[PDB]
């Protein structure tokens, strides 16, 4: 199938409580494989998946040096953002960055990403062309001008087409027993009366990987989108994910309802009913 590599940076100021914290995490699809945390006793890029562990000392030194450099840059970025938004030095603020590459079955680049936020709001994003920018406001327009002058988009493009996809293909091979394995959901329907005349049907999906899934309830074959309570897909802590979908049905009409499940690990979409 298709796969993605994503890195996530969070830089958080905390005036009066030292320098800003910088945390980076790296993912292939829904599997985390590295972390860096400036608040750690000895900050280093560190393995979080067994298949990355075979990378040698030059890898870990390289990644660590890069994270320390990036942490410095983003601490300065936090100061710069204060001036761009006329903000005081007593407040805590957050910069977030996500970037990476998606590839298809053949390992060819599908698309690259490089997006940043300030205090949880879009700040500046690299467009899909990997050559132009979208700035969310007049502050980010200043950064955009700086990045245009420095041909930053050209640099990112080279990385996204090159190293990003190369490293992703390598990780996919090194972790092929897990990254290239989809675990289908284990599914069942529970039933609970609410009153004398209504009951809850809850459609469960457990133990699946990757996280992407669709649970839908149909009544007489029509989607009950507006009427379905859909909980956020959640991690079990063993790599797999969980989700459920629930609908309130009139007592005696339970068999008019079908739960529909779509997941990469299923050869065909499942249909279940309460039994």
């Amino acid at each position: 199938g298709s796969h993605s590599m994503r890195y996530f940076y969070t830089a958080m100021s905390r005036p009066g409580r030292g320098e800003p914290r910088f945390i980076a995490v790296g993912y292939v699809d829904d599997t985390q494989f590295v972390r860096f945390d400036s608040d750690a006793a000895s900050p280093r890029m560190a393995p979080r998946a067994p298949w990355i562990e075979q990378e040698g000392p030059e890898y870990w030194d390289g990644e660590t040096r890069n994270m320390k450099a990036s942490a410095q840059t983003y601490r300065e970025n936090l100061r710069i953002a204060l001036r761009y938004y006329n903000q005081s030095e007593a407040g805590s603020h957050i910069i977030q960055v996500m970037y990476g590459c998606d590839v298809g079955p053949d390992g060819r680049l599908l698309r690259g990403h490089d997006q940043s936020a300030y205090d949880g709001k879009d700040y500046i994003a690299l467009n899909e062309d990997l050559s132009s920018w979208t700035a969310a406001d007049t502050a980010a327009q200043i950064t955009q001008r700086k990045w245009e002058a420095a041909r930053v988009a050209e640099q990112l493009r080279a990385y996204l087409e090159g190293l990003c996809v190369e490293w992703l293909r390598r990780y996919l091979e090194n972790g092929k027993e897990t990254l290239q394995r989809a675990d289908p959901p284990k599914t069942h329907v529970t039933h609970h009366p609410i009153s004398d005349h209504e009951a809850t049907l809850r459609c469960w999906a457990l133990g699946f990987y990757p996280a992407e899934i669709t649970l839908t309830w149909q009544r007489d074959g029509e989607d009950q989108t507006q009427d379905t309570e859909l909980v956020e897909t959640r991690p079990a802590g063993d790599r797999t994910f969980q989700k459920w979908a629930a609908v309130v049905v009139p007592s005696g009409e339970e068999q008019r309802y079908t739960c529909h499940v779509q997941h990469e690990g299923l050869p065909k979409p499942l249909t279940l009913r309460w039994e």
Binding site: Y7, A24, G26, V34, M45, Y59, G62, E63, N66, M67, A69, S70, T73, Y74, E76, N77, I80, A81, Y84, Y99, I142, T143, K146, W147, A150, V152, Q155, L156, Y159, L163, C164, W167
Partner: peptide, 10 residues
């Protein structure tokens, strides 16, 4: 590097 080393100031 696997991460990008392209970090340009805001």
């Amino acid at each position: 590097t696997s991460t990008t080393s392209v970090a340009s100031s805001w």
